[PDB]
Amino acid sequence: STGSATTTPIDSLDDAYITPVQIGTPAQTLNLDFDTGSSDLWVFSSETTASEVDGQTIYTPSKSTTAKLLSGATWSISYGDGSSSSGDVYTDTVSVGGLTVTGQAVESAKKVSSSFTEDSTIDGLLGLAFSTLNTVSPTQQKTFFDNAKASLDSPVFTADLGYHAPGTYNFGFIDTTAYTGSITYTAVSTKQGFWEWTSTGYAVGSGTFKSTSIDGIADTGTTLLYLPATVVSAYWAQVSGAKSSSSVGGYVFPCSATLPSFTFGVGSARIVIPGDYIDFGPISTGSSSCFGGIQSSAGIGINIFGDVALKAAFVVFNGATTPTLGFASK
């Protein structure tokens, strides 16, 4: 089997991407944030504290003839950005772009943190990291991909995120028309539960490539590109007037600037992030100070190849017995 679904930016800045997901019978379609940095499929629901729901579409398990409460199971998750959610668990039928999993754990939120409430466009998350990170207790549950894997034509999914435009998540096949040149594959460590890999270096603009190992995670659920302070400083030094602002929480730059591109290495291959991808707009409405899309990972404890990086590529998440990652230009 295969599946293919369009993923759409939630706003004009590509702060996140939502993908429609069918849950239950009859289908209840929710727009979920596909997150290769976590491993829970959780949804706003009829069980979510009413004051914490503000415009989201909810899953109502009592209206699904295939929903079954997973007795005694609870979940609770905290994300790198400080947000969190928790609740109980159903199993139900879940379909993405024509690919159907029966008995998928659907984690129903009883509580969500304010940032979730405040974002009306995201109805929940669909985790695509390794199932070892799943938070369901006392019996850990499998991700949608893990459940689908054996049925897929090939045990892979691909992320093709758009810049200010829709893109695609495919399951079970590689669309050879969706990228240019070849896909370069690179080793993955699953030891921390992530799609963790080592970039071979970077360049700023038309500058020389610096060969240096950068361990980080391919994370579709993180907006920005978080890299070591040395790398980030080298980037922003090429933007007149750019500075790190403790009050804002990162590098800012004059909105009048033209940003240089940023290249990262995948083996001997190179992925070029155009400068415009690194512009996250005014820090506050009407400001002429703009927020940067490349930020320091210092104090995160891990480098993160988030959407800023991934949307410059066609990305293969290869879930073979030994997982790997592939990157192509597009």
Please tag this protein with its features.
330 residues; mainly beta; Cathepsin D, subunit A, domain 1; 2 domains; seven-stranded mixed sheet; six-stranded mixed beta barrel; 4 helices
Question: Could you walk me through the main structural features you see in this protein, from its secondary elements to its overall organization?
Answer:
Keywords: Aspartyl protease, Disulfide bond, Hydrolase, Protease, Signal, Zymogen. With 330 residues, the protein is mainly β. It has 2 domains: 5-174, Cathepsin D, subunit A, domain 1 (Beta Barrel); 175-330, Cathepsin D, subunit A, domain 1, CATH 2.40.70. Helix content is 7%, strand content 44%. It is built from 4 helices and 24 strands. The chain has helices at 114-118, 144-148, 229-236, 307-310, and strands spanning 3-9, 17-23, 28-35, 41-43, 68-78, 84-96, 99-112, 124-127, 156-160, 167-171, 184-187, 196-204, 210-218, 225-227, 243-245, 250-254, 262-266, 269-273, 279-282, 289-292, 294-296, 303-305, 314-318, 324-328. It has a 7-stranded mixed β-sheet. The protein has a 6-stranded mixed β-barrel with strand order 2-3-8-4-7-6. Strands 15-16-20-19 form a 4-stranded antiparallel β-sheet, with no helix packed on it. The longest helix is centred in the C-terminal third of the chain and has 8 residues, at 229-236. The protein starts with a strand and ends with a strand.
